[PDB]
Amino acid sequence: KPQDRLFAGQIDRMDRFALRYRARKYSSEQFRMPYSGLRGQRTSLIPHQLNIAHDVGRRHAPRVLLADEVGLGKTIEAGMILHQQLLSGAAERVLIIVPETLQHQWLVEMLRRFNLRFALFDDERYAEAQHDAYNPFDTEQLVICSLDFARRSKQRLEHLCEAEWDLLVVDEAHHLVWSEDAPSREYQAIEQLAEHVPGVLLLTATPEQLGMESHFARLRLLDPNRFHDFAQFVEEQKNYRPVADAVAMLLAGNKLSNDELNMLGEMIGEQDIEPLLQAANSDSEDAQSARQELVSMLMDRHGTSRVLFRNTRNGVKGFPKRELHTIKLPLPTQYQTAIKVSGIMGARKSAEDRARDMLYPERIYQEFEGDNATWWNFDPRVEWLMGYLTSHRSQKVLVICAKAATALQLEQVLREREGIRAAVFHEGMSIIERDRAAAWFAEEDTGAQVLLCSEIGSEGRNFQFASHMVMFDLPFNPDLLEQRIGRLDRIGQAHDIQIHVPYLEKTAQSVLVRWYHEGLDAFEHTCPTGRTIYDSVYNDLINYLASPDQTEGFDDLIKNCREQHEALKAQLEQGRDRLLEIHSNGGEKAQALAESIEEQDDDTNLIAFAMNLFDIIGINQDDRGDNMIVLTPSDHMLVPDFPGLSEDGITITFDREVALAREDAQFITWEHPLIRNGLDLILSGDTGSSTISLLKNKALPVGTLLVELIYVVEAQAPKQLQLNRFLPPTPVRMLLDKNGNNLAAQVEFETFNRQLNAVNRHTGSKLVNAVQQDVHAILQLGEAQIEKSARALIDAARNEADEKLSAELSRLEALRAVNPNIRDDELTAIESNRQQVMESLDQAGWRLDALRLIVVTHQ
Ligand SMILES: [Cl-]
Ligand SMILES: [Cl-]
Ligand SMILES: [Cl-]
Ligand SMILES: [Cl-]
Ligand SMILES: [Cl-]
To answer: Which domain holds residue 279?
Structure first.
């Protein structure tokens, strides 16, 4: 109790009493932020992602299937939901099941994007953990593992289902093949998992132009009672199709026949549809408002969109356009001889592999003219690269080639013959090396102009500043082609993408140039036709690669491929479930959500307080200069070791854009662990809770007594109840006088704190005991007043709680009457939470947390 700490002669500093109150004030305001758990993640503020996170992340025991189109943010939405439920206390134990080849990607993603360190569980980890616990999976709160690891023994899968996970995440759930009569031994292991875990997130793809029926096998796992018969689900999807068609006619700018519109009327099962129905269709002045309320009611009756989210690249805006630039170069004679040697020596090998050689002329001239053959002197592609680079020196250029060997040789030549700064970015590099290259390439104007990448890594960091891409060569299959473009074709880029493809005339590359552009239209547009056509055309296309000399018969392959492309394109556009796409991307409300967070992101109090907090704790803050502070410990640190700090130091940034370019730095927000740790460090300890201070004011009597009192109103409830939305620990300042009159409302904290000053150890010590009978008599005066202020907070909180928590229960009740996806558990959870919160609010108390004594002098 802080007064007994001050009575008994413990007098802390006056700048630590200042930080302590600011911390309780700031923490209180942030707990109540509307979009808590949605600001600390190291991502762009993309609406369609944020919509899913907000919708799903706030549910209780969420069970969802994320089927967003590839490249839309399936894994980002997954981590956001995790970040929300973990920060809100809704979840504590999480299990992510990933194919082993993807385990490392998830480990780094969850750590750098969401500040979540998962423990990877392999056989080694599992064995050493069997000794440490009855259930091996009780030793870690957050665990990644593979389904093959999970399925190894039966005794192992039993421990997993008994580990009491709050949430489960399964990546690539489409690899789970399921027959109604014969489920695979893998599908049987997951269904057993999804039955022992309340919340379940399923990430999947719906490729090869199939319908939502393929999803039933997984939808069956989320809500087994809603989805219990396959055929009925098929019947439903066929019968829902006309509405989607008619809906698709409306917003496209068509008139809707009355016969058509009495199928939309059947979907929304009401009787007063007609007046609202026609204004949206007659195109009167307010047809805009009649369409938007019309569509909204339609979505609430959709059979799956509440439990299935599928954003397409057509239902989402923001992606940059992609423009192509092709350059036809003379095939140098040194290669012509080099390939004919492979021709003769290529006696016994399939056209499949014969064509694999013809792809890269550079790397067969290194087998017949000896390794390291100086191919960088006659190859026109190199000449074009230099010329292009030296002419656009102020542009960041991503240069992608097939193999790392060619990339390393290119770096050396661009450096040693044109003074071009170029970092190599291949997969063999470690994580620190790639960060080093990404940093150099991200330097605004003094760093690497070029990033020479081997066949690109799979969906790593964002080069939002780069808008130019060069294809030094082209891969065989069209999936890697779209993957290369993927590192740039993302929401949040600076400008549109310019693709430059310098290709040697009359070679396998020249073939792939025409096939990709004329046939599949794969460079400038994103329609996923490539793979289907690639399979239907393989053996023909191969021969034109293994021998680009035989040119006749080719030009018809191209128009045949483009015919397939347009046909495949057409079939997909007519399969769009535009209702599901609008519900997935969140619509207009979601873009509004994205901008509120974009505005909270300029919090300067956060940076000022962080500097203030870090400095008190004793953390040296060297400002390197480019919006990045380097934090290092000191001899004057206040604690043995701080959770996040290491002696080698850490880089931090408060700017969301710098963070996206420098993933090696910590993105500092109110939700970042550094702040939450330092906050707890102060407010858990009791330093800064009791001090004395002198005031120099000519306009007051000597020896007058002001007592600054920081009470704290608190509720005692498990964090699972989320009381912090309505009543977190909230400070109540009071500046009492000798008669118990409160002045705090008139005397703001900062200005008052400015004009105050401390004492020396001795004089202050008994200066307190000079009025120990007085200050003690001052406290009970406020004791009767704090209870008035305390009950004021409680009552307002109970109003704010009962208001919002009943509004949510009403909405869920409205949906259950109109939608089949609302579970019994959901409505029960809200009801149980409303009662428990109002109960925990009726039991809130107050306490004296901090106390600063004031004595006026005129000396
Ligand atoms: Cl201060
Ligand atoms: Cl695998
Ligand atoms: Cl899997
Ligand atoms: Cl397209
Ligand atoms: Cl708790």
So the answer is: 235-303
* 68 labelled binding-site residue: yes
Is 671 among the annotated ligand-binding positions? Answer: no
- Decide if 500 is inside a domain: yes
Two tokens, residue 829: 């959870």
Between the CA of 575 and the centroid of ligand 4 the distance, in Å, is 14
CATH code where residue 652 lies: 3.30.360.80
Q: Give 20's Cβ-side CA count (13 Å radius).
A: 27
The verdict on residue 309 lying in a domain is no
φ, ψ for residue 469, nearest 5 deg: -130, 140
- Residue from 527, 504, 523, 505 nearest 515 by CA: 523
Q: Are residues 111 and 165 in the same domain?
A: yes
552 in a structural domain? yes
Distance 190 CA to ligand 3 centre (A): 9
Measured distance CA(441)–CA(450) in Å, rounded: 7
Of the three residues 250, 268, 303, the one that is the final residue of a domain is: 303
CATH of the domain at 509: 3.40.50.300
- For residue 240, report the distance from its CA to the centre of ligand 4, in Å: 25
Helix or strand run (H / E) with residue 127: helix 123-132
- Residue 620 CA, ligand 1 centroid: distance in Å: 18
Strands 629-632, 620-623: parallel, antiparallel or unpaired by DSSP? antiparallel
Same domain, 399 and 508: yes
Name the residues around ion ligand 2, CB cutoff 5 A.
99, 101
- Asked if residue 437 lies in contact with residue 406, where contact means CB atoms within 8 angstroms, the answer is no
Residues 503 and 368 in one domain: yes
Looking at the structure, tell me whether residues 276 and 328 fall in a common domain. no
Which residues lie across from 308 on neighbouring strands? Answer: 65
Binding residue per annotation — 79?
A: no
What burial class does residue 127 get, using C-beta atoms within 10 Å of its C-beta: 0-12 exposed, 13-18 middle, 19+ buried? exposed
Residues 58 and 161 both lie in one domain: yes
Three-state DSSP state, 176: coil
Quote the ligand 5 centre to 141 CA distance (angstroms).
15
Picking from 669, 704, 722, the residue at the C-terminal end of a domain is 669
217 alpha carbon – ligand 3 mean position (Å):
14
Q: Which two tokens stand for residue 433?
A: 């090396």
Q: How far is the CA of 607 from the centre of ligand 4 (A)?
A: 44
Residue 577 phi, psi dihedral angles, 5° rounding:
-90, 80
Sheet holding 620-623, edge to edge: 620-623, 629-632, 650-653, 666-667
Do 610 and 714 reside in the same domain of the chain? no
Which residues, including other chains, have CB under 8 Å from residue 512's CB and lie 6 or more apart?
359, 474, 476, 545
Which helix H or strand E contains 237, and what residues bound it?
Answer: helix 230-251
Q: Is 132 annotated as a binding residue?
A: no
Give the distance (Å) from ligand 4 centre to CA of residue 429. Answer: 35
836 and 689 assigned to the same domain = yes
Q: How far is the CA of 526 from the centre of ligand 4 (A)?
A: 5
Q: What is the CATH number of the domain that holds 208?
A: 3.40.50.10810
C-beta separation of 206 from 174 below 8 A: yes
Contact 362, 335 (CB under 8 A): no
- Tally of structural domains, the chain: 5
Helix (H) or strand (E) holding 282: helix 273-282
Residue 73 is labelled as binding a ligand: yes
Q: Please tell me whether residues 535 and 634 are part of one structural domain.
A: no
Closest by CA to 501, choosing from 322, 373, 313, 364, is 322
| Residue 75 labelled as part of a binding site | yes
User: Which protein residues have a CB closer than 5 Å to ligand 1 (ion)?
Assistant: 15, 18
Ligand closest in space to the Cα of 750: 1
Is residue 310 one of the residues assigned to a domain? no
> From the CA of 98, how far away is ligand 2's center (Å)?
8
Final resolution, Å: 2.6
Calculate how far, in angstroms, residue 714's C-alpha sits from the geometric centre of ligand 1: 26
Instruction: Identify the nearest ligand to the CA of 616 by its number.
Output: 1
